[PDB]
Design a protein around this ligand. Sequence first.
Ligand SMILES: [Zn+2]
Ligand SMILES: [Zn+2]
Ligand SMILES: [Zn+2]
Lengths: 671, 91, 86, 37, 82
Amino acid sequence: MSLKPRVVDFDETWNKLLTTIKAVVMLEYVERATWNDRFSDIYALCVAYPEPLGERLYTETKIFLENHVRHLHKRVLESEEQVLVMYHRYWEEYSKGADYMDCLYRYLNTQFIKKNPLMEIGELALDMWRKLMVEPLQAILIRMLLREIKNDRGGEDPNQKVIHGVINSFVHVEQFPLKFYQEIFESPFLTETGEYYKQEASNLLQESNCSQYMEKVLGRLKDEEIRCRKYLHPSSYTKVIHECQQRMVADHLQFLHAECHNIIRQEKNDMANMYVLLRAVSTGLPHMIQELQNHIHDEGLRATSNLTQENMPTLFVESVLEVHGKFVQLINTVLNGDQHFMSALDKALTSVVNYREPSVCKAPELLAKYCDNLLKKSAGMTENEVEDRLTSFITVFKYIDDKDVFQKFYARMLAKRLIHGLSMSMDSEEAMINKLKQACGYEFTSKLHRMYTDMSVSADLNNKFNNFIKNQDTVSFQIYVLQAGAWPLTQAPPQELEKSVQMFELFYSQHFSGRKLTWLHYLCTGEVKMNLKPVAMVTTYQMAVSEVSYKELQDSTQMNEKELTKTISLLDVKMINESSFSLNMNFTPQEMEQTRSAVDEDRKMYLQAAIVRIMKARKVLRHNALIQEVISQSRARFNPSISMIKKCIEVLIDKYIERSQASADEYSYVA
Amino acid sequence: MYVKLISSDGHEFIVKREHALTSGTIKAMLSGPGQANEVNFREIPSHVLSKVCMYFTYKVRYTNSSTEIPEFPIAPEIALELLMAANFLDC
Amino acid sequence: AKKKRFEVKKWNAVALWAWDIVVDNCAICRNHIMDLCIECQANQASATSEECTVAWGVCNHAFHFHCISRWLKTRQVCPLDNREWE
Amino acid sequence: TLKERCLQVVRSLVKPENYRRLDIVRSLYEDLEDHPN
Amino acid sequence: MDVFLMIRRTTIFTDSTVFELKRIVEGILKRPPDEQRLYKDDQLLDDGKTLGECSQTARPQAPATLAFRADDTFEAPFSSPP
Ligand SMILES: [Zn+2]
Ligand SMILES: [Zn+2]
Ligand SMILES: [Zn+2]
């Protein structure tokens, strides 16, 4: 009748309604109109007696659910070991009908949500499916199910649709949704595949060679992931494989680590797979990395050893660069890597470039004569390339332990390279100091920098004197002027000649406030080329007159015979040549020897600066603790001698530092 | 794409399916297996289903829009029946 | 050609510039008068990149400004000559 | 909602003492006494 | 222009000239427009004028208002409870 509340019979709507339920179950054919009638045939029930009555429909529905579940339990039990096939047709003929029944009981629950154990008819029907699975099937089925997965090696393939429906049928029912799936299925499958890959791990390891074992297990894992994606739910993808890689690899890792020593000393794929497998292990990589470090130490040292007595720094630089290129090609090519292996390379070549033969360690000086050698004129090589070769040199410089002596040597390299016009490009030799500066910092390349600026300042200054020359009443040479602290060159200690220095020197007194200049004579030239156009070596040795012998004019003018006797050099080369000396008819180890000390005192100054810098910021330190921090600070300059820092302390306590009593070590600071 | 809604008095009401999917009962009706689309009702009169449909059109069209929301006229004698079928349609 | 003519054409020379002392490195500290002192070479703070602060003294001995300034605070006597420096 | 706002329109023309006697819907007169403002 | 209608014979809910409106009517009814006339309770609606000229006179919760053609030229209420 109308939608007015009518007391309707209890079997009239229940016969056609029940047969409609059974028609919705198994996706049987239901008519397009009776479905349009059932909602009325339920709303009419849930209203007027003159009280609601859905409590009956819920219970009766649950009864039909139970009976159907038990019927399909006897059919499923009838199936001899094919319970999962009729169970697949069961679930795939049960799910859509269950959801359609849940949509069919909308009003049954919209007036029932205000009264809720076990509401949500859909959740209750799936609860009855749970009542189908709690049966000994859950002991049988999984045992019968894993048996179709146990056929893993060469046991393929059953219907991924059927098994995927059986396993996927577990994660569907929930009001912790993965609880039933995890307890019923994930632990037995997990531990059973664990046993499977333990047994087959030992079975494979007894069979194959090392590289063949790694190849095989890699293929096995690559297949295993695809399998887990065919059968299982994604919620276990990370877990299942984590067992596999734990039993096939990392369960025998002593063996792999043992074959590593061999494999990293073969340039030959097996090592790439070695990285791949050891990486997914708790502790797989450290031994391999260690062995690559030792390998590179060996081959590297071997390269940089084959050059003895051959007096070539170029071969040493090119050799170290050769090794570095080799192993960068290696590590980037095969290891997907790296940073660890790269650091091992860096440590190894760090130990290669420092020799301890008895000298010592002969690395920085050679790396100074490589630069000095590569910057000279050599009239030869080609520029637009020298800057490339230096760009390579940046690395071999990077690895040097003592950058200290490299600096102090390159200072004299540059000094002689400038004060005698030996360089090839000012624009380039600046860019070299730019390289060293971007490698170390401002402190390292300062004396080099303004040591390079005094040539520009000296040029402009020479111009200014060229103006001041003729700028008074009445009225030929050019001078370099140097900042006198950035220049390691010494005087190496005769009266004024033709003169002309003072008529020029009054300029430098009036132009600067109080600068005191000192004249160096050790590096002063003259004018060559006798008149007879084409050797002509006459710059120093200002004597200029008989023709007279050497020991017959021992009575020279006011000058000492310290270096005079070593230069009496003009009667040796061309022009004077004791019996008879006739007129012509035509045309550094010891320096370094005593240079080895300025490095020592510069280290004393540097460590002194470290002492003050540290003792001011932090207030007090014990005698041990200040050291290792002086060390921490002066790391990249050089490894400082502990024999020096203590005496440096005992010097600074005479100036900034006080110490009271040594019961517990203690060192305070004084303003 | 288009569904029909028939009242107990005989008046048909054709409208797109999504306009009818507003009430949970009707979206449970078109969810009926068989393919099933046309729908009838043998208990709701026409003077009520017409008001229910006119109620659908508003909140299908005008919701979260930019305008001053007006009120809703309901006749003082069908309001009982409209309330009843409103309880029926779960809307 | 000629044997004894020796006409003296183009000359050259090179020289360093410093301040008006000997000096043996500004005895207050043991660094050069034209190279950074202890507090500045160690402080790693702001300073002029070529001449930090050259301080001439009216007593005709020049030192680094803040060396003889800190020493000037702790005791007014001049170190080299045991007198009052400026 | 049509149901609840029709409830609200009806409660403006029905005494609070006639929420059971109208016999509108037997699963709804239990809701006629549960919807304040 | 943005107007709802109540075209009746059947009452269909759908939503620019009169011709395109007859297309919208032709949507499910599937009949050409030359077989349809439109009347507003006393008048004849022409095709040469747009819908906006022939509005916002019909709210969406209660809008307002089809004479078909049989051969050539077009020819030829809810309940109430007690
Ligand atoms: Zn200073
Ligand atoms: Zn003095
Ligand atoms: Zn000083």
